[PDB]
Design a protein around this ligand. Structure first.
Ligand SMILES: CCCCCCCCCCCC(=O)OP(=O)(O)OC[C@H]1O[C@@H](n2cnc3c(N)ncnc32)[C@H](O)[C@@H]1O
Length: 572
């Protein structure tokens, strides 16, 4: 980031070490649970990392070995992650395998990455193991690690191109893809983030984002640690239970940067009653980033109208685009500036070119700019491999020192994504994303592959239905079905449930809708957009999820079936 001595460091390990010498008592990370606060300084973070690394070394872990990190959000996850890096080990973070699908995912990650050790908290060695082992991997409770081991740490010779950690992406549920992020990849992107976000020493980051997804890890934890900036955090569970707490904490801690995928702004609008806004002051919040999924004008306008009386300014909104394969940040605008939009015509014909329309012409729709290329971005036709003109839709191809090394132990998939070559032309990351450049700003339009097809091959509908049927929620329900609907230019994950009691009162309905949203988010890392409640026995008898699902999809579309209530995330 800023000071030259830090720019010169060759890994995040040395950045943390040096910060701990220059400013041992500077607050780094704060984690919040309810009204409880725990903070660690740079001196502490460095000492914990050394202690953990010395333990890994004492237990036979070698540079390049993978160490699985099984943690809920919190300071222990962050200590363990740095501790892995200090040992030259490849960190492999995973969500605690609390339910069936999360456990299946963990097993597939273990099989792929073949870690030598797993770290987790003492409580979890009891919950997830029978020398304790988790899925045959020797396990170690982080609490067993004492600070008197710190001085035993032996520095390794970390090279730029060495892999620092694996970040597993969503999708590919059947063969999870572990993106190999090198030490050089990581520092390159951290610098791009610090710079592009105009961070400085007033900056304070707040995050509730999953630390097991790139944005919440690389953006909201590793960047602040790298840049000497406070990270103030809570768990996604805390956010979903009480989204107001996000805005309360931003208020209390005068956070300047905080953000999320687009849905979370709608979730705030939907969940926070006018009277509960009393006490907010969001004037400090100058960069409200919006990335990881399609960015919606309507969402941001709703949020702006809902919070403007409490100091929130629409200019704070900062659309951005990226993916794990490029470490994180690929495009973004200028902080404090108004993001741009374009209005496309209903009819886009077949030329792959963008067809524009007057600012509210019939059937027109708006796309939000994801900002300027920060990594090099080319729009390339995915079939012919010929570059697209501006205002012509093609695949988003990326190149820079932030582009990752491949997928762990998946050589064919790695060639499929990281070896893009332009017809008659460098090597590019092929994102699978479609979009276009207009006046040097990137407009993301969709995915090459049909999202309904993707949901299907990942077994999302069947697995979401399983979750509902196996949660305590099933006690007030009959049968259920989950599916994705494409509905003018957007995709909406839709859940339909029979309810035993068709007179379910408005409060119970609201609670039920929220419980459903939380369940799917936790079990599947997906966001439900629409929930429909219908009477018992309203779905025909069948032993087939597919038949049941097709019936619900078809009769939602008909507008025939009896409906008890509907919930729409993005509607007021
Ligand atoms: C200090 C904070 C700085 C944080 C800077 C954060 C910058 C945003 C980086 C998000 C990292 C990413 O989401 O990871 P992942 O690999 O799981 O999935 C990536 C996929 O998601 C999609 N997608 C992300 N953006 C999108 C956008 N704008 N429009 C539409 N589709 C977007 C794409 O399809 C993409 O391929």
């Amino acid at each position: 980031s800023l000071k030259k001595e830090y720019l010169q460091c060759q890994s995040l390990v040395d950045v943390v070490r040096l910060r701990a010498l220059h400013s041992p008592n500077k607050k780094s990370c704060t984690f919040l649970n309810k009204e409880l606060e725990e903070t660690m300084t740079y001196e502490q973070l460095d000492q914990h990392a050394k202690a953990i690394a010395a333990t890994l070394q004492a237990e036979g872990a070698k540079p390049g070995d993978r160490v699985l990190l099984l943690f809920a959000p919190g300071l222990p996850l962050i200590q363990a992650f740095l501790g892995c890096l200090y040992a030259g080990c490849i960190a492999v973070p995973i969500y605690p395998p609390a339910q069936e699908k999360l456990l299946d995912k963990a097993q597939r990650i273990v099989t792929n990455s073949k870690p030598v050790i797993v770290l987790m908290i003492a409580d979890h060695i009891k919950k997830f193991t029978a020398n304790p082992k988790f899925l045959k991997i020797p396990a170690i409770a982080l609490e067993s690690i004492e600070l008197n081991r710190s001085s035993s740490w032996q520095p390794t010779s970390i090279k730029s191109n060495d892999i620092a950690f694996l970040q597993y992406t969503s999708g590919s549920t059947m063969h999870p893809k572990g993106v190999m992020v090198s030490h050089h990849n990581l520092l390159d992107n951290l610098n791009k983030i610090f710079t592009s976000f105009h961070m400085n020493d007033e900056t304070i980051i707040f995050s509730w984002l999953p630390p097991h997804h790139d944005m919440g890890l690389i953006g909201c934890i590793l960047t602040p640690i790298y840049g000497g900036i406070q990270a103030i955090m809570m768990s996604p569970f805390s956010f979903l239970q009480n989204p107001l707490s996000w805005l309360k904490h931003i208020t209390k801690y005068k956070a300047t940067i905080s953000g999320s995928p687009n849905f979370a702004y709608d979730y705030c609008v939907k969940r926070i009653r006018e009277e509960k806004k009393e006490g907010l002051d969001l004037s400090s919040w100058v960069t409200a980033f919006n990335g990881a999924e399609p960015v919606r004008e309507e969402t941001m306008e709703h949020f702006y109208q809902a919070f403007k009386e409490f100091g929130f300014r629409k200019e704070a909104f900062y659309p951005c685009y990226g993916l794990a394969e490029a470490t994180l940040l690929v495009t973004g605008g200028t902080p404090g500036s108004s993001y741009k939009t374009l209005t496309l015509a209903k009819e886009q014909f077949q030329d792959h070119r963008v067809h524009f329309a007057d600012d509210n012409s019939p059937g027109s729709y708006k796309l939000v700019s994801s900002g300027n290329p920060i990594q090099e971005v080319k729009i390339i036709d995915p079939d012919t491999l010929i570059p697209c003109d501006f205002d012509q839709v093609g695949e988003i191809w990326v190149q820079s020192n932030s582009v990752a090394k491949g997928y762990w132990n998946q050589p064919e998939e790695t060639r499929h994504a990281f070896a893009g070559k332009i017809k008659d032309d460098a090597i590019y990351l092929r994102t699978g994303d479609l979009g276009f450049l207009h006046e040097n700003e990137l407009y993301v339009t969709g995915r090459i592959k049909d999202l309904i097809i993707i949901y299907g091959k990942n077994h999302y509908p069947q697995d979401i239905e399983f979750s509902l049927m196996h949660s305590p929620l099933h006690h007030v329900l009959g049968k259920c079905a989950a599916f994705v609907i494409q509905e003018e230019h957007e995709y909406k994950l839709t859940v339909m449930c029979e309810v035993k009691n068709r007179f379910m009162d408005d409060v119970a309905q609201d609670n039920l809708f929220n419980e459903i949203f939380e369940l799917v988010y936790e079990n599947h890392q997906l966001e439900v957009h629409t929930i429909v409640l219908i009477p018992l026995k309203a779905m025909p008898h069948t032993t087939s999820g597919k038949i049941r699902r097709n019936f619900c999809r078809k009769h939602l579309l008909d507008k025939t079936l009896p409906i008890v209530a509907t919930w729409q995330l993005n509607k007021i």
